[PDB]
Amino acid sequence: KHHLTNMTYGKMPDGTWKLAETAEEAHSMGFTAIHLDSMGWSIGLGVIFCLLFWIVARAANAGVPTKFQSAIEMIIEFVDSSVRDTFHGKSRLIAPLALTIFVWIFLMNLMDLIPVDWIPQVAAFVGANVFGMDPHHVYFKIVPSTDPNITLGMSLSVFVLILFYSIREKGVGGFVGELALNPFNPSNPVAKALLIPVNLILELVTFLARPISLALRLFGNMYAGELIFILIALLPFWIQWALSVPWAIFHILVITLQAFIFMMLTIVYLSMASEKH
Amino acid sequence: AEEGDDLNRTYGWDYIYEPEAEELLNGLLVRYIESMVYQGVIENVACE
Amino acid sequence: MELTLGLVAIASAILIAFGALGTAIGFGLLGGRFLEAVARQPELAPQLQTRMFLIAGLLDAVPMIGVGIGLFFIFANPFV
Amino acid sequence: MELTLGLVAIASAILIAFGALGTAIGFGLLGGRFLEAVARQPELAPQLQTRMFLIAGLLDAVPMIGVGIGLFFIFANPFV
Amino acid sequence: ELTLGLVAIASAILIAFGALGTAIGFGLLGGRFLEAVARQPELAPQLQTRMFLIAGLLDAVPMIGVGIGLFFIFANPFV
Amino acid sequence: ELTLGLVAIASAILIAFGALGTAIGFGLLGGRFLEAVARQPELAPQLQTRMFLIAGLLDAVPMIGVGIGLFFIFANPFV
Amino acid sequence: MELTLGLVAIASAILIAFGALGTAIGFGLLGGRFLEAVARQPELAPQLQTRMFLIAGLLDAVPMIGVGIGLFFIFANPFV
Amino acid sequence: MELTLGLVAIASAILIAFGALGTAIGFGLLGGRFLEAVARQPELAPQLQTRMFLIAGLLDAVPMIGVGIGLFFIFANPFV
Amino acid sequence: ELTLGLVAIASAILIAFGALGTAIGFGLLGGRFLEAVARQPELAPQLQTRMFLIAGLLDAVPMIGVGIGLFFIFANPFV
Amino acid sequence: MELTLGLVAIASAILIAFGALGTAIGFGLLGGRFLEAVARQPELAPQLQTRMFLIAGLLDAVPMIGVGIGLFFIFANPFV
Amino acid sequence: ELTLGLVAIASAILIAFGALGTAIGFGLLGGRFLEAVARQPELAPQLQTRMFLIAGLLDAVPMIGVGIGLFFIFANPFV
Amino acid sequence: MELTLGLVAIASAILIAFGALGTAIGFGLLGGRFLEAVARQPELAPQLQTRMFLIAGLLDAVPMIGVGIGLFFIFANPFV
Amino acid sequence: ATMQCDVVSVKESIYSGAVTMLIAKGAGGELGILPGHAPLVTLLQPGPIRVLLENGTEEIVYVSGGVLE
Amino acid sequence: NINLTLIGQAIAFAFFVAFCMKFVWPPLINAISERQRKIADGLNAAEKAKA
Amino acid sequence: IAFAFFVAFCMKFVWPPLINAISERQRKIADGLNAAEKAKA
């Protein structure tokens, strides 16, 4: 049992499933590489979803929609209303950007609602097919979305958007500078200790740990979900199998609010980027 | 009364209610009714 | 070393509980005042709840951060 | 040995007791504000109570998380 | 020796913080309920019903901590 | 030795927390009560009824902690 | 014996010190609210003081118990 | 024994400083509402101050006792 | 050996205090925010904007502490 | 010896620290309402600030005593 | 060895503890500013002037704690 | 001797941190109410700022003493 | 500065014109009023109300029941 | 072992589907129907206006 | 690695979704036109 627990734990924390920078792909102990061999699953899900959208994007629908296109219309109407009412005076085609990032993170965290054991169970047949059976049980499978590497990728992608749209209006003068909270204070030791470090750390903190916190808070929520699953998996005979259900739906609501507020924060950050400094 | 006026002039501000809305409203009702009675009496005088 | 592990367990417990208290206070204040406000203005409840969830999201980031990193050290402890 | 056992037992006590404190007092303030509000408008008791429970559910997530972690650690600690 | 005292003090701080929290919540609820009854003495039946209903929400895990302290005092693992 | 001081400290913590919570919450409650009286001295009888009600609704777990301290002081295990 | 006697001294300090905060802070709350109420209606000062002395006499009884435990220990108690 | 001397030093710091803190808290609590009342009601500010003094002595009694125990132990810490 | 555990503990404390600071400053701001907006729902966006700027004004040194703590978690001076 | 040196130095540090904390809290809570009232009516400021200084000096006394004990040990602890 | 770990602990306490205090102060400040601008959306400019002034004057001694912590981080005294 | 160095670092951290926090909490208290006052009635802003500075200087004094004691422990080395 | 302040009984007006400083005793406490003051409504208590004029002198007007805005 | 977990998980899933349909789908269908009916009413208003 | 990935993913997709929105917005205009038309008559 606890053998099985640790054998599961081999899978989750460090991702990049079967990455090997001149190393092994099924070792769970390489601990030395730079490849992210787990992003592809998230990327493929995003691509297949964006094509699922493209099916209706290449289409023009104006009459009476069925359930599919009806829901499509309410969704797109709400997202366009939100992006529009939030901010304005800005035409560089960002509303689709927010829509896309929101719905992708939506689906990405949604897909993690399955029992943890079923990914390695379905993968065990491929393991019998290729790359071993029990040395796969420790860490050889591709993992669904729990890897903070992916989250880090979204964080810095949005950060790149932030930097580029801050210089959208050539705010380079305001981008290099900042509004210092104070130039100095009396007790001239204080003045010296304030002049150099303080406003610099002020300017730095205005942007740095915000996307970092975004990504690793996603990781915290989603990792928390998976670990709750694994812990409830103890004694599935005399249990009523009702430990999860309340917390599970709560965390579902959490995921919804996650995606929503992340895209909200995207909106406010792009507003500040569209605001001169 | 005044169904289309006096709701425009209230900007993003409100009169602060040092008393509860209830008692101040009651005093307003009292005084406003008495004022109308007064004016009607004066009008009756003029008609006379 | 195992007592160092106990140190780690204590630190994680600190973070998780103590940020949980952060949430327990913030969300409670928001709930109380929100109920009072919506009582004052029972008509525009949609936008009220909208901005309410806005604030709720803005609130509990860092405490949940501490919870997550604490559990991470509980299981993926650096320098076990 | 004994030191680690005491460490984890104290950690569990921290989590559960401290979260219990927070949730208890949070309920106190929340209910006080809810009663104060509903006193103004008895007409909206149903919807107001609906939102009351809607947020009461928001409160208790990580308290229960800590309760579960402490209970399991009571049953089986990590770092055996 | 050490484990005994450590478990005992864990239970003690458990129940002490529980008493603290339940008293604080009692006061918090009480003040505003008194305020409301001062405003609405007439609905005091229904208000009091809601009062005790929400008080039922209050002190679940405090009593849980008290019971866990009793468990530690009487019989608990790792002793 | 160590267990003795641990038990004494734990009992002191229990009673100290009980006293702190009682005093603080109880004082807040009395303040709101006198506030309500200043609102309406006429409902003071019913208000006092509620007072003794909620006082009896506030003192239980503190007295439990008092009993815990007494049990520790007079005769308790882990000594 | 030095260990446990010093710990008992710490414990008595806790006893009396918590009694001190409870009395001081609770009576400060009482004073603030009392002065507010009496200024609201200076006429009913007699009944106000009536209820206030009643509730205050009901107040510090448990602080009195803690201080009395300290007195028991300082005069003579078990474990010493 | 000198370890117990450090213990007593810690306990004394506890009692005296902690009671000072409580006294400050209670003083501010009373003072805020006292000040507001006398500002709004200067004509009766006299008997307001009368009640305020009436309760000022009621406030510090337990803190006074705690400080007294601390200073007595400073002079002569019993359980020598 | 234990000073690595000391580094871990200190980083944890940095994180934990930044957590309460953020979580309770946010609580206060949200309370007052919802309080105010109900008066002038029409004036919501301006207040919202100011509130966002305040939230930014709130959280700087908490991320400073958490960043330095995580740096010490990974890059360890004072071993 | 060294251990007792640290014991007494830490105890003195605590005595000064809690005194500073409590004093700051007291002045802040005083000043809030003082500013509020003096804003309300610019007339009664003289006796207003008179009672303000009265109670402010009334407050920090025990903190000043803790400060005195700390500096007492600073010149020389009444102990080894 | 112990010295470096304890120095790290002390710097961590400094930074985190101060950051929490700065957070609570900014909480009160921003809440009051928000309510003020809610009642008078007009005097916002000079009110924010006061706001930045008072906040810039707010951090000085927690800033000192930060400076001491960083001085420890680069070249700690009492090595 | 390393014990003494750690203890003095701890004492200096205490002295600086708690005093800084006194400054922080008091400054928040003053700032909220001063902002309130200047908002309600902007005309008194000069005298309001005067009172604000008067109380600000009065408050932070003892925390400055703690800061100076920290510096005195840092550069000068008592008990070392 | 100056605020346009008007005092009026139900029958007819009593005072009108700019005023600089208003001192009354509201439904709650006494207050001081200067132009630019927040929007507020208060219940007049019986007694005289005294206000400071642009000339540097101060008017006083008695009230027995009424409301103030 | 594995099957014991699967059976409980499947029970959870069945409850998921049943309760989620029950408590969530009527509002969605209602929204869809309202959208369609308002569009149709606007259309009919168009033809009758031309008439 | 993900940064260029995602920015390139969205950029050479960024136009068609907005191009879609014109249909909806002009559609609403037709409904508005129906209301105005009913009023003039």
Author numbering:
A (entry chain a): 15 to 291
B (entry chain g): 194 to 241
C (entry chain J), D (entry chain H), G (entry chain R), H (entry chain Q), J (entry chain P), L (entry chain O): 1 to 80
E (entry chain G), F (entry chain S), I (entry chain K), K (entry chain L): 2 to 80
M (entry chain e): 2 to 70
N (entry chain p): 2 to 52
O (entry chain b): 12 to 52
Please give sentences taken from the publication describing this entry:
F1Fo-ATP synthases are large, membrane-embedded macromolecular complexes that harness energy from the proton-motive force (pmf) and use it to synthesize ATP via a unique rotary mechanism. We solved the electron cryo-microscopy structure of the F1Fo–adenosine 5′-triphosphate (ATP) synthase from A. baumannii in three distinct conformational states. The A. baumannii ATP synthase has a subunit stoichiometry of α3β3γδεab2c10; its overall architecture resembles that of other bacterial and chloroplast ATP synthases.
Structural alignments of the γ-subunit between states revealed that the three states differ by almost exactly 120°.
